[PDB]
Scaffold this active site. Structure first.
Site, PDB file in Angstrom:
ATOM      1  N   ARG A   8       0.922 -27.701  10.939  1.00 16.19           N
ATOM      2  CA  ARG A   8       0.401 -26.619  11.823  1.00 16.19           C
ATOM      3  C   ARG A   8       1.572 -25.841  12.429  1.00 16.19           C
ATOM      4  O   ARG A   8       2.645 -26.377  12.644  1.00 16.19           O
ATOM      5  CB  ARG A   8      -0.417 -27.215  12.969  1.00 16.19           C
ATOM      6  CG  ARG A   8      -1.418 -28.235  12.426  1.00 16.19           C
ATOM      7  CD  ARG A   8      -2.506 -28.453  13.476  1.00 16.19           C
ATOM      8  NE  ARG A   8      -3.339 -27.209  13.541  1.00 16.19           N
ATOM      9  CZ  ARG A   8      -3.258 -26.402  14.559  1.00 16.19           C
ATOM     10  NH1 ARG A   8      -3.111 -26.896  15.751  1.00 16.19           N
ATOM     11  NH2 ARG A   8      -3.307 -25.126  14.337  1.00 16.19           N
ATOM     12  N   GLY A  10       3.479 -25.318  14.894  1.00 12.76           N
ATOM     13  CA  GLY A  10       3.870 -25.809  16.258  1.00 12.76           C
ATOM     14  C   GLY A  10       3.904 -27.337  16.360  1.00 12.76           C
ATOM     15  O   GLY A  10       3.796 -27.880  17.443  1.00 12.76           O
ATOM     16  N   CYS A  11       4.031 -27.991  15.237  1.00 10.94           N
ATOM     17  CA  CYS A  11       4.112 -29.484  15.224  1.00 10.94           C
ATOM     18  C   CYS A  11       5.427 -29.909  14.553  1.00 10.94           C
ATOM     19  O   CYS A  11       5.452 -30.281  13.398  1.00 10.94           O
ATOM     20  CB  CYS A  11       2.917 -30.052  14.454  1.00 10.94           C
ATOM     21  SG  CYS A  11       2.221 -29.056  13.113  1.00 10.94           S
ATOM     22  N   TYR A  13       8.053 -30.753  12.786  1.00  9.98           N
ATOM     23  CA  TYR A  13       8.219 -30.942  11.301  1.00  9.98           C
ATOM     24  C   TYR A  13       7.547 -29.821  10.497  1.00  9.98           C
ATOM     25  O   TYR A  13       8.121 -29.292   9.568  1.00  9.98           O
ATOM     26  CB  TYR A  13       7.579 -32.273  10.895  1.00  9.98           C
ATOM     27  CG  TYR A  13       8.481 -33.493  11.147  1.00  9.98           C
ATOM     28  CD1 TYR A  13       9.867 -33.412  11.133  1.00  9.98           C
ATOM     29  CD2 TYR A  13       7.896 -34.739  11.301  1.00  9.98           C
ATOM     30  CE1 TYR A  13      10.635 -34.551  11.262  1.00  9.98           C
ATOM     31  CE2 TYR A  13       8.671 -35.872  11.428  1.00  9.98           C
ATOM     32  CZ  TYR A  13      10.042 -35.786  11.407  1.00  9.98           C
ATOM     33  OH  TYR A  13      10.809 -36.922  11.517  1.00  9.98           O
ATOM     34  N   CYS A  14       6.343 -29.499  10.898  1.00 12.82           N
ATOM     35  CA  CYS A  14       5.559 -28.437  10.206  1.00 12.82           C
ATOM     36  C   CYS A  14       6.393 -27.167  10.107  1.00 12.82           C
ATOM     37  O   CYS A  14       6.666 -26.666   9.020  1.00 12.82           O
ATOM     38  CB  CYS A  14       4.295 -28.168  11.042  1.00 12.82           C
ATOM     39  SG  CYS A  14       3.229 -29.582  11.441  1.00 12.82           S
ATOM     40  N   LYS A  18       8.184 -25.447   6.827  1.00 13.77           N
ATOM     41  CA  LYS A  18       8.002 -23.987   6.613  1.00 13.77           C
ATOM     42  C   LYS A  18       9.372 -23.310   6.546  1.00 13.77           C
ATOM     43  O   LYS A  18       9.648 -22.629   5.598  1.00 13.77           O
ATOM     44  CB  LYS A  18       7.143 -23.446   7.766  1.00 13.77           C
ATOM     45  CG  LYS A  18       7.325 -21.932   7.951  1.00 13.77           C
ATOM     46  CD  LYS A  18       8.288 -21.688   9.125  1.00 13.77           C
ATOM     47  CE  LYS A  18       8.426 -20.194   9.392  1.00 13.77           C
ATOM     48  NZ  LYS A  18       8.957 -19.510   8.183  1.00 13.77           N
ATOM     49  N   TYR A  72       8.752 -35.289   5.806  1.00 10.85           N
ATOM     50  CA  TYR A  72       9.611 -34.073   6.005  1.00 10.85           C
ATOM     51  C   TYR A  72      11.056 -34.368   5.628  1.00 10.85           C
ATOM     52  O   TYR A  72      11.668 -33.628   4.883  1.00 10.85           O
ATOM     53  CB  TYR A  72       9.537 -33.583   7.463  1.00 10.85           C
ATOM     54  CG  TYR A  72      10.556 -32.448   7.639  1.00 10.85           C
ATOM     55  CD1 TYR A  72      10.360 -31.227   7.021  1.00 10.85           C
ATOM     56  CD2 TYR A  72      11.733 -32.665   8.324  1.00 10.85           C
ATOM     57  CE1 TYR A  72      11.331 -30.252   7.076  1.00 10.85           C
ATOM     58  CE2 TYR A  72      12.701 -31.688   8.379  1.00 10.85           C
ATOM     59  CZ  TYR A  72      12.507 -30.476   7.749  1.00 10.85           C
ATOM     60  OH  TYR A  72      13.484 -29.505   7.775  1.00 10.85           O
TER      61      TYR A  72
END
Length: 85
Positions: A8, A10-11, A13-14, A18, A72
Protein backbone atom coordinates in the site's frame (compact mmCIF):
# COMPACT_ATOMS: atom_id res chain seq x y z
CA UNK A 1 9.73 -8.44 -17.90
CA UNK A 2 6.80 -7.57 -15.61
CA UNK A 3 6.71 -6.86 -11.87
CA UNK A 4 3.84 -6.78 -9.35
CA UNK A 5 3.93 -4.98 -5.99
CA UNK A 6 1.40 -6.18 -3.38
CA UNK A 7 1.62 -3.30 -0.90
CA UNK A 8 0.00 0.00 0.00
CA UNK A 9 1.14 3.58 -0.55
CA UNK A 10 2.44 4.18 2.99
CA UNK A 11 3.55 0.84 4.50
CA UNK A 12 7.22 1.57 4.25
CA UNK A 13 8.47 -1.59 2.43
CA UNK A 14 5.61 -1.04 -0.04
CA UNK A 15 6.89 2.37 -1.00
CA UNK A 16 10.43 0.97 -1.11
CA UNK A 17 9.52 -1.86 -3.50
CA UNK A 18 7.74 0.77 -5.59
CA UNK A 19 10.80 3.06 -5.51
CA UNK A 20 13.05 0.20 -6.57
CA UNK A 21 10.73 -1.13 -9.31
CA UNK A 22 9.95 2.34 -10.57
CA UNK A 23 13.70 2.91 -10.76
CA UNK A 24 14.48 -0.25 -12.82
CA UNK A 25 11.95 0.90 -15.43
CA UNK A 26 14.48 3.58 -16.54
CA UNK A 27 17.51 1.27 -16.60
CA UNK A 28 16.20 -2.11 -17.79
CA UNK A 29 13.64 -0.91 -20.42
CA UNK A 30 12.01 -4.35 -20.57
CA UNK A 31 10.79 -3.76 -17.01
CA UNK A 32 7.14 -2.83 -16.58
CA UNK A 33 5.69 -3.08 -13.05
CA UNK A 34 2.08 -3.10 -11.81
CA UNK A 35 0.81 -1.69 -8.54
CA UNK A 36 -1.48 -3.84 -6.39
CA UNK A 37 -3.00 -2.77 -3.00
CA UNK A 38 -3.55 -5.61 -0.51
CA UNK A 39 -6.47 -3.73 1.11
CA UNK A 40 -8.13 -2.77 -2.18
CA UNK A 41 -7.98 -5.99 -4.16
CA UNK A 42 -8.94 -8.28 -1.24
CA UNK A 43 -6.05 -10.37 0.14
CA UNK A 44 -6.02 -12.14 3.55
CA UNK A 45 -3.34 -14.73 4.49
CA UNK A 46 -4.37 -17.87 2.65
CA UNK A 47 -4.15 -15.95 -0.67
CA UNK A 48 -0.57 -14.91 -0.02
CA UNK A 49 0.36 -18.42 1.15
CA UNK A 50 -1.16 -19.77 -2.09
CA UNK A 51 0.34 -17.12 -4.40
CA UNK A 52 3.68 -16.57 -2.61
CA UNK A 53 3.97 -19.40 -0.10
CA UNK A 54 4.48 -16.90 2.73
CA UNK A 55 6.99 -17.32 5.46
CA UNK A 56 5.50 -15.80 8.63
CA UNK A 57 5.90 -12.24 7.33
CA UNK A 58 3.14 -9.61 7.01
CA UNK A 59 2.98 -6.93 4.28
CA UNK A 60 3.93 -6.09 1.70
CA UNK A 61 5.56 -8.60 -0.68
CA UNK A 62 6.92 -8.61 -4.27
CA UNK A 63 6.29 -10.74 -7.31
CA UNK A 64 8.37 -10.74 -10.50
CA UNK A 65 7.09 -12.49 -13.66
CA UNK A 66 4.54 -14.00 -11.27
CA UNK A 67 7.11 -16.07 -9.35
CA UNK A 68 7.45 -15.22 -5.65
CA UNK A 69 10.49 -13.27 -4.52
CA UNK A 70 9.78 -12.73 -0.81
CA UNK A 71 8.92 -9.63 1.25
CA UNK A 72 11.31 -6.80 0.29
CA UNK A 73 14.93 -7.31 1.34
CA UNK A 74 14.81 -10.22 -1.07
CA UNK A 75 13.49 -8.09 -3.97
CA UNK A 76 16.16 -5.49 -3.19
CA UNK A 77 18.96 -8.07 -3.29
CA UNK A 78 17.39 -10.29 -5.96
CA UNK A 79 16.94 -7.18 -8.11
CA UNK A 80 20.43 -5.92 -7.44
CA UNK A 81 21.75 -9.31 -8.53
CA UNK A 82 19.59 -10.37 -11.48
CA UNK A 83 18.77 -6.92 -12.86
CA UNK A 84 21.63 -4.55 -11.98
CA UNK A 85 24.51 -7.03 -11.39
Amino acid sequence: MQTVIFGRSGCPYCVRAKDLAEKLSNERDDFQYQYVDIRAEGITKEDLQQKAGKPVETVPQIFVDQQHIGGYTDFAAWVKENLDA
